[PDB]
Design a binder for this molecule. Structure first.
Ligand SMILES: Nc1ncnc2c1ncn2[C@@H]1O[C@H](COP(=O)(O)OP(=O)(O)O)[C@@H](O)[C@H]1O
Ligand SMILES: Nc1ncnc2c1ncn2[C@@H]1O[C@H](COP(=O)(O)OP(=O)(O)O)[C@@H](O)[C@H]1O
Ligand SMILES: Nc1ncnc2c1ncn2[C@@H]1O[C@H](COP(=O)(O)OP(=O)(O)O)[C@@H](O)[C@H]1O
Ligand SMILES: Nc1ncnc2c1ncn2[C@@H]1O[C@H](COP(=O)(O)OP(=O)(O)O)[C@@H](O)[C@H]1O
Ligand SMILES: Nc1ncnc2c1ncn2[C@@H]1O[C@H](COP(=O)(O)OP(=O)(O)O)[C@@H](O)[C@H]1O
Ligand code: ALF
Ligand code: ALF
Ligand code: ALF
Ligand code: ALF
Ligand code: ALF
Ligand SMILES: [Mg+2]
Ligand SMILES: [Mg+2]
Ligand SMILES: [Mg+2]
Ligand SMILES: [Mg+2]
Ligand SMILES: [Mg+2]
Length: 1609
DNA sequence: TTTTTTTTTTTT
């Protein structure tokens, strides 16, 4: 075995034998730009340095001869070949091997070795493993020849992925398995970092692993630097190795050799060795002796004879220039084209993009990719070059291209049908030699033929990737031999599950990375502004890959809209920077002469003096470029025409043509229904044959806007379709907005794939003009719908959308169909920089949209009292047909739509076409109205004059102004419709007007005034409703009243008690049929929602209510600890739930009501700090949202007997929003329905009211509201009559074997739920014993009475709060004592660290059995609570001071609040299922509050306010505290009763004192002055003595107590 | 033969 150096010392060591073995095969592989070619050239250079002869087979067609020279290669003696086919490449290898005159041969890219059959055949033609069998045959033949000539053959290879492998390294290598076996050495090379000169990236930090080795041990590795334009930092290695081997001394930063200092810092020591080559050789020789395992490494006139002969043979076999010395190959010289940006041309090092090469440009949407591309085309055309543009994205604006200086009339342009077609056109144009630059717009849009013909949702895993890989193989050679530049534009995608480095990728696989000679990352970094107006984009381009000069330089410039790259701007900045242009303050000077004040003016001057500009530019280039360069056309036109004729013959008529003459490319627009929006869009409306996205918050007007565009289109004879994926379209409302309901095609699809397949089918028919998809957020993948809630389908919707765009874009353009996608907003978590808002469904839509609109409600339109419309703003956030970032403001008037004529007035006035003198509006001298309202009415009334004004407003304000047949449509329409129905079932698409299942049906809410407020008379069936409000505002109550009303009509209901706080007895009092109410207290939030889905799908349940989304705790959270962060886990759960539920609920006609709680949003001192739990999804999916609030007390003199209540309709999709209802909730009775009826009756003049007397139809019905109410309750028939009339008068939107299938399906779904989630997971409320309320005494009799139920409820949460020393702990210990006295087990969490055990004993606590904990952190305290709850062995737990519950992070805003909120979520369920009472004591901070946030307010079943109101005195001594407790919240009995008792110190609550007072109050104990008597017998004088007597007579005391309880409980 | 592509707030 004999070896050759690799050019790296550490690699030579890693290889064990000191280098690569002669007469063997070697493979080198790695990612793009990892240093494969470089390494290879370094081995060639080292070999040549020793008199060896080398050959380079550049199959990749990307060798830079000048660069090879810089790496020390003898260019003039390097044999070089750029072969046509892979077989040719390998035949040359064999011939060179057999000659015995070549020492090392390197083949650059086996990946580029294309079989002859493949080259000749089309792109997208199958030749399975043809390259593999070719390689296999080559090795067989080569191995023997290489050995007998002692020739080293190095194969460079690229990396590919292996699709379908979910188990081990997914990486592979090209060209099959043969090379693996035949290689004596295999090397894996990788770039592991950057080498930096402060700012500049000057090299690559590199690692090589010896992955296979037949000449020494494998698996050693080398690390070294590749310095650009220099090569392997050899002397760097030498320093490190020298130091490591103790030949070079290193004291701190000082390097020494043999006593003499050689440099400070690695950089300087390296420079010294470079400078002293003799000493370097000495050190190297020693390093090798020390570290190499093996000791390795007429006569030449026979070589030259045989060389010339083999060379002559190769040329005879394969043609003239098939092999030659690199130095003399002119076709190998790098030639460049300007990019249109001066600073980019500088960044690229060589002055522009290289001819005959592939270039990639990628970046986010609207970053300037197409623009840049067109600017390079314009520059090329300006120099007489010929260009072609492949518009695969179907979004090129010819007029815009012209504005950027493109010669539209000579730009070849193609909008190809398939990706293979696109690439076949590229190949054909390349091969012709008549086209100079070709740009392919979006590889992302290059859709494989099989994908286009397949359905949406069919998987074609890496079909585009393998297509691209085949394309590069074929294109690289053709492009070089024609000197044609090919630019690929690419989009960005996210790679999922990557939280390390860069999550960004590029479309179309890995091939392009490798084959690109330059890769550019372009980005918008800011706005260019003319004060107000955004007039351009501030832009940055990074040179991310570079094969013709150093990489990683960057350019910054402006893109000015409608003008292009600000070239002269760059020139000023560069001129100033290079001291060619002088800048004194704001004054710019050239050669002494002032050229302008401010950058703007200096720029204008250069534009004006082109000769001087050229001079400055020439100098800037000389100063800043690192790699500067230095019958004929009638053959071109002949070959061009022939290739063009060929393309048209192969792919049909208009498959390629001059842009200027393609009529189908002219942008045509449709009105949006808003005039100011049409103006904002620049072109006058939305573009036909394009994709548009509209997004914004809930109820911002997305659907409305969309329907207005449909209406306007229909008004012009166009055909429209509406895909209601959100399942929330109101046909009657659509009609009010002027939509032709009877001709609007409408679909409520089952899956997202179905929705998109329908879009495709409608597009392809060519019979539909505009299609709108309502909510991409609602487009649920098939796998997701069939899966369970909580199954993860990470980015399944995203990959679906990405596939859809690919297929849709082409079809929409060729049918001239407008597709509008509505989207919702989501928050992106962990983003406190810029904008936390996003959009659903991934990144594809951003890129493919020609227009993106951000719509927002910015205020209310008011008729004094009534909210009659929404004030609206739309921002044009993306625009491909005119400048972006303009905005529109208009009104949406409910039940009417966009106020188009309103805009017209304002615009008319603004443009001085309509005169406005005070309040009077005039047109052409004639008065048209007083006030905006009347002027609007006038224009509406005079449509001809309105058109005239509108036409003028458009002329004045638009920047981008515009301009058998139907029986084929109807034929194709019917066919596509028939197809859709055959594929997806009967009613899967139909005319809206005739879809009965779309009509809105309602259920009463139990409140008459609410039913009126809702406009439609109640809540809508088959929809989602949300109710939210503060604690005890009446959410559950309202809900139960709707259930009761539903049951009263024979409907079936279910209640999901996630809050674990439903009182069955109370539900009964509110009129609920307890025995038939399905009830569930689920363990996790996913379970709760899975039950909802299952009940919905059964079709046997009519209304379902979920009590507290706030209580819907994700499974991961429940199983995790308290204080574990599950940021937005509940939100993503809710978001998935809505997606699945919406469709099921509609198709079963099931109403789902979600109750929600309120939380505060921290750091918000602007508008409303209130929010709702569980994220944003529910806002969007709810058809009605209700805000309920307690606004006062209903009183029977003393007693609080009900709550005065207000409900605001905060969102409404079935009638106008923002109306409100006010009614009473009477405790233990419910909503006072007949009360409302009286008030409404009187208000509507149906019931007469003379003073206090109420009359109906002449006959007196009662004196006072109370009695009139009683009368209606008593005469139900008359009440119905009055109610019917009140509804007719006040509703704005009035409505209009069978049960044995229900019971069969119900039982089945119930059986299923129980099988899935365990025994008692759902049952009838009436028979659930675990739901009954059980109580524990508080230790105070009067408190037990105040609580109504006789004490605190087991399995619930209780809060006690009050000032310091008010008796909180005491009370708590008394409840513990009472519990222990009954054999219960108690625990005390002393977070306040202030429990006195001796005192607890005095209050009668069993100290020895009281579990006690003084926890370190709040999370620990609560984790202990949870653990004790879950054990089921503790009966009552008290936590002393939530105020003392300090979060873990704090012992290192609202951290405690979010902790408490998480705790309640987890505790509520566990406490109920163990029947454990948890009491929280709280402190005070009405200006009073409580610690630890809002959660506890909501979750407490009882809240107690305790207060010291005076002193108990033994003459002198204060011996106790006089105490008052108010029941401030109560879920088990009426609230607001109060107790008063004494706390006697060292004794506790004075129980017998209470007994006296109660006894006296109830007339059981007689009190004559100061004398107390029982049953005639005197028991004491003064309260003190009576108390002592009862204490002394316990039997009598029991008797009195028993009676007091019977009377007062 | 050879990758595909994000999800979504928390709470005085
Ligand atoms: N002509 C050149 N001028 C300056 N730097 C170059 C040149 N060619 C390559 N480089 C740099 O050398 C490194 C490796 O290049 P190369 O050996 O071509 O990688 P590979 O062959 O593995 O694709 C890259 O960082 C690249 O930018
Ligand atoms: N027809 C047009 N009129 C005005 N501005 C445009 C037009 N087309 C593109 N622009 C603006 O130029 C910038 C870059 O657009 P473009 O080059 O199409 O980006 P990309 O191709 O990278 O998606 C964006 O700000 C865009 O709005
Ligand atoms: N059927 C209807 N009757 C009355 N007003 C409606 C109706 N539908 C929607 N609106 C009102 O119009 C505005 C926008 O509604 P919509 O276009 O559905 O919002 P989005 O689709 O953005 O969620 C809201 O104020 C809404 O309450
Ligand atoms: N079991 C009950 N007995 C008497 N009054 C009750 C009962 N449950 C609730 N209430 C009262 O009805 C009103 C509304 O209670 P609720 O509907 O549970 O409020 P929310 O569900 O909004 O927290 C409150 O005044 C509450 O005290
Ligand atoms: N160990 C004790 N000895 C005497 N008096 C006490 C003792 N502990 C509490 N008190 C008195 O009992 C009353 C209420 O105390 P406590 O129940 O601890 O109030 P809180 O816990 O609400 O601050 C106060 O007047 C206090 O002075
Ligand atoms: F293999 Al390369 F640029 F030559 F990625
Ligand atoms: F790449 Al684009 F609009 F053309 F984002
Ligand atoms: F997008 Al919506 F109600 F339809 F907020
Ligand atoms: F929402 Al509640 F008591 F049920 F405040
Ligand atoms: F002493 Al305190 F609440 F004030 F326990
Ligand atoms: Mg290379
Ligand atoms: Mg583009
Ligand atoms: Mg909508
Ligand atoms: Mg409730
Ligand atoms: Mg205390």
């Amino acid at each position: 075995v004999e070896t050759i150096s690799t050019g790296s010392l550490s690699l030579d060591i890693a290889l064990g034998a000191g280098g690569l073995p002669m007469g063997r095969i070697v493979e080198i592989y790695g990612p793009e730009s990892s240093g494969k070619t470089t390494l290879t050239l370094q081995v060639i250079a080292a070999a040549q340095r020793e008199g060896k002869t080398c050959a380079f087979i550049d199959a990749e067609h990307a060798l830079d001869p000048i660069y090879a020279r810089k790496l020390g290669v003898d260019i003039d003696n390097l044999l070089c070949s750029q072969p046509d086919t892979g077989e040719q490449a390998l035949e040359i290898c064999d011939a060179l091997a057999r000659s015995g005159a070549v020492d090392v041969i390197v083949v650059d890219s086996v990946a580029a070795l294309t079989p002859k059959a493949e080259i000749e055949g089309e792109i997208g033609d199958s030749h399975m493993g043809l390259a593999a069998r070719m390689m296999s045959q080559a090795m067989r033949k080569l191995a023997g020849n290489l050995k007998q000539s002692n020739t080293l053959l190095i194969f460079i290879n690229q990396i590919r992925m292996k699709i379908g492998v979910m188990f081990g390294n997914p990486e592979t290598t090209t060209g099959g398995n043969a090379l693996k076996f035949y290689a004596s050495v295999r090397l894996d090379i990788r770039r592991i970092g950057a080498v930096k000169e402060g700012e500049n990236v000057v090299g690559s930090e590199t690692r090589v692993k010896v992955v296979k080795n037949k000449i020494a041990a494998p698996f050693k590795q080398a690390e070294f630097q590749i310095l650009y334009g220099e090569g392997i930092n050899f002397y760097g290695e030498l320093v490190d190795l020298g130091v490591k081997e103790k030949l070079i001394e290193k004291a701190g930063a000082w390097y020494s050799y043999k006593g003499e200092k050689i440099g400070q810092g690695k950089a300087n020591a390296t420079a010294w060795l470079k400078d002293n080559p003799e000493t370097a050789k000495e050190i190297e020789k020693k390093v090798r002796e020390l570290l190499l395992s093996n000791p390795n490494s007429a006569i030449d006139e026979n070589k030259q004879k045989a060389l010339a002969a083999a060379l002559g043979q190769i040329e005879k076999q394969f043609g003239k220039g098939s092999i030659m010395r690199l130095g003399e190959d002119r076709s190998m010289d790098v030639e460049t084209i300007s990019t249109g940006s001066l600073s980019l041309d500088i960044a690229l090092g060589a002055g522009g993009l290289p001819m005959g090469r592939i270039v990639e440009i990628y970046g986010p949407e609207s970053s300037g990719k197409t623009t840049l591309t067109l600017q390079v085309i314009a520059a090329a055309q300006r120099e007489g070059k010929t260009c072609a543009f492949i518009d695969a994205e179907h979004a090129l604006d010819p007029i815009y291209a012209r504005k950027l200086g493109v010669d539209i009339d000579n730009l070849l342009c193609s909008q190809p049908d398939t990706g293979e077609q696109a690439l076949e056109i590229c190949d054909a144009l390349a091969r012709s030699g008549a086209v100079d630059v070709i740009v392919v717009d979006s590889v992302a849009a290059l859709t494989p033929k099989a994908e286009i013909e397949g359905e949406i949702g069919d998987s074609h895993m890496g079909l585009a990737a393998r297509m691209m890989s085949q394309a590069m193989r074929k294109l690289a050679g053709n492009l070089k031999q024609s000197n044609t530049l090919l630019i690929f534009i690419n989009q960005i995608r996210m790679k999922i599950g990557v939280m390390f480095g860069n999550p960004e990728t590029t479309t179309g696989g890995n091939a392009l990375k490798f084959y690109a000679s330059v890769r550019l990352d372009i980005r918008r970094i800011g706005a260019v502004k003319e004060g107000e107006n955004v007039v351009g984009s501030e832009t940055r381009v990074k040179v991310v890959k570079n094969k013709i000069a150093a990489p990683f330089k960057q350019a910054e410039f402006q893109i000015l809209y409608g003008e292009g790259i600000n070239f002269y701007g760059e020139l000023v900045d560069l001129g100033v920077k290079e001291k060619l242009i002088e800048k004194a303050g704001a004054w710019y000077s050239y050669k002494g002469e002032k050229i302008g004040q401010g950058k703007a003016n200096a720029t204008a001057w250069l534009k004006d003096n082109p000769e001087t500009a050229k001079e400055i530019e020439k100098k800037v280039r000389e100063l800043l470029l690192s790699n500067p360069n230095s019958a004929i056309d009638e053959n071109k036109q002949k070959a061009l025409a022939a290739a063009l004729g060929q393309i048209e013959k192969q792919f049909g008529k208009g498959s390629i043509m001059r842009l200027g003459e393609d009529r189908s490319m002219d942008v045509e627009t449709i009105s949006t229904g808003s005039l100011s929006l049409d103006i904002a869009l620049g072109a006058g409306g939305l573009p036909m044959g394009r994709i548009v996205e509209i997004y914004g918050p809930e109820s911002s007007g997305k659907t409305t806007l969309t329907l207005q565009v449909i209406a306007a289109a229909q008004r012009e004879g166009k055909t429209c379709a509406f895909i209601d994926a959100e399942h929330a379209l109101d046909p009657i409302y659509a009609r009010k907005l002027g939509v032709d309901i009877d001709n609007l095609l409408c679909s409520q699809p089952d899956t997202g794939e179905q929705a998109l397949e329908i879009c495709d089918a409608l597009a392809r028919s060519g019979a539909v003009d505009v299609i709108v998809v309502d909510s991409v957020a609602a487009l649920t993948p098939k796998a997701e719908i069939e899966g369970e809630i909580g199954d993860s389908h990470m980015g399944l919707a995203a990959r679906m959308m990405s596939q859809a765009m690919r297929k849709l874009a082409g079809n929409l353009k060729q049918s001239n169909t407008l597709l509008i996608f509505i989207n919702q907003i989501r928050m992106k978590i962990g983003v406190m920089f810029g904008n936390p808002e996003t959009t659903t469904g991934g990144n594809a839509l951003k890129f493919y949209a020609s227009v993106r609109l951000d719509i927002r409600r910015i205020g209310a339109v008011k008729e004094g009292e009534n909210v009659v419309g929404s004030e609206t703003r739309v921002k044009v956030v993306k625009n491909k047909i005119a400048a972006p970032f303009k905005q529109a403001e208009f009104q949406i008037l409910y039940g009417e739509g966009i106020n188009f004529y309103g805009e017209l007035v304002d615009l008319g006035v603004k443009e001085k076409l309509i005169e406005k003198a005070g309040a009077w509006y005039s047109y052409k001298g004639e008065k048209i109205g007083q006030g905006k309202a009347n002027a609007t009415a006038w224009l509406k009334d005079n449509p001809e004059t309105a058109k005239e004004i509108e036409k003028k407003v458009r002329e004045l304000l638009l920047s981008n102004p515009n301009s058998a047949i139907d029986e084929n449509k109807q034929k194709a329409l019917a066919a596509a419709l028939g197809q859709i129905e055959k594929q997806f079932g009967k009613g899967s698409i139909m005319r809206l007007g005739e879809d009965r299942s779309m009509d809105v049906e309602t259920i009463s809410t139990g409140s008459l005034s609410l039913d009126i407020a809702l406009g439609a008379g109640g809540l809508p069936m088959g929809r989602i409703v949300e109710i939210y409000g503060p604690e005890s505002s009446g959410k559950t109550t309202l809900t139960l009243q709707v259930i009761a009303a539903a049951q009263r009509e024979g409907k079936t209901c279910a209640f999901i008690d996630a809050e674990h706080a439903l009182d069955p007895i109370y539900a009964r009092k509110l009129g609920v049929d307890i025995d038939n109410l399905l009830c569930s207290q689920p363990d996790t939030g996913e379970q709760a929602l899975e039950i909802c889905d299952a009940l919905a799908r059964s079709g046997a349940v009519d209304v379902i209510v979920v009590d507290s989304v706030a209580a819907l705790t994700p499974k991961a959270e429940i199983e995790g600890e308290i204080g574990d962060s599950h940021m937005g886990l509940a939100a993503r759960m809710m978001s998935q739930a809505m997606r699945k539920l919406a469709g099921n609920l509609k198709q079963s006609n099931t109403l789902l009501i979600f109750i929600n709680q309120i939380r505060m949003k921290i750091g918000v001192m602007f508008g409303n700090p209130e929010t709702t739990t569980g994220g944003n999804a529910l806002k969007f999916y709810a058809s009605v949202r209700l805000d309920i609030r307690r606004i006062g007390a209903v009183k029977e003199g003393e007693n609080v007997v009900g709550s005065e209540t207000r409900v605001k309709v905060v969102k409404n999709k079935i009638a106008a929003p923002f109306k409100q209802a006010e009614f009473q909730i009477l405790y233990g009775e419910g909503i006072n329905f007949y009360g409302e009826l009286v008030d409404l009756g009187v208000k509507e003049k149906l019931i007469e009211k003379a003073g206090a007397w109420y009359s109906y139809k002449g006959e007196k019905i009662g004196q006072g509201k109370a009695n009139a109410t009683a009368w209606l309750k008593d005469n139900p028939e008359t009440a119905k009559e009055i109610e019917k009339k009140v509804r007719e008068l006040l509703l704005s939107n009035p409505n209009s074997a069978i049960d044995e299938n229900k019971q069969k399906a119900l039982a089945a779904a119930l059986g299923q739920i129980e099988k899935q989630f365990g025994k008692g997971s759902i049952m009838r409320l009436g028979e659930d014993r675990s739901m009954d309320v059980e109580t524990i005494s508080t230790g105070s009799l009067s408190l037990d009475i105040a609580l109504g139920a006789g004490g605190l409820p087991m399995g619930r949460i209780v809060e006690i709060y009050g000032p310091e020393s008010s008796g909180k702990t005491t009370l708590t210990l008394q409840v513990i004592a009472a519990a222990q006295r009954e054999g219960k087990t108690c625990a005390f969490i002393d977070a306040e660290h202030a429990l006195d055990p001796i005192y607890a004993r005095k209050l009668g606590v069993d100290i020895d059995n009281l579990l006690c904990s003084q926890p370190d952190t709040g999370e620990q305290a609560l984790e202990i609570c949870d653990a004790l709850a879950r054990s089921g062995a503790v009966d009552v737990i008290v936590v002393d001071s939530v105020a003392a519950l300090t979060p873990k992070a704090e012992i290192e805003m609202g951290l405690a609040a979010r902790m408490m909120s998480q705790a309640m979520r987890k505790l509520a369920g566990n406490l109920k299922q163990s029947n454990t009472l948890l009491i929280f004591i709280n402190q005070i901070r009405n200006p009073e509050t409580t610690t630890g946030g809002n959660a506890l307010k909501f979750y407490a079943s009882v809240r107690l306010d305790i207060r010291r109101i005076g002193a108990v005195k033994e003459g002198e001594n204060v011996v106790g505290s006089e105490t008052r407790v108010k029941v401030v919240k109560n879920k088990i009995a009426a609230p607001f009763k109060q107790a008063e008792f004494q706390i006697l110190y060292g004794e506790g609550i004075n129980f017998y004192g209470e007994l006296v007072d109660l006894g006296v109050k109830e007339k059981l104990i007689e009190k004559a002055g100061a004398w107390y008597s029982y049953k005639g017998e005197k028991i004491g004088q003064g309260k003190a003595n009576a108390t002592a007597w009862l204490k002394d007579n316990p039997e009598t005391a029991k008797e009195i107590e028993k009676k007091v309880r019977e009377l007062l409980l």
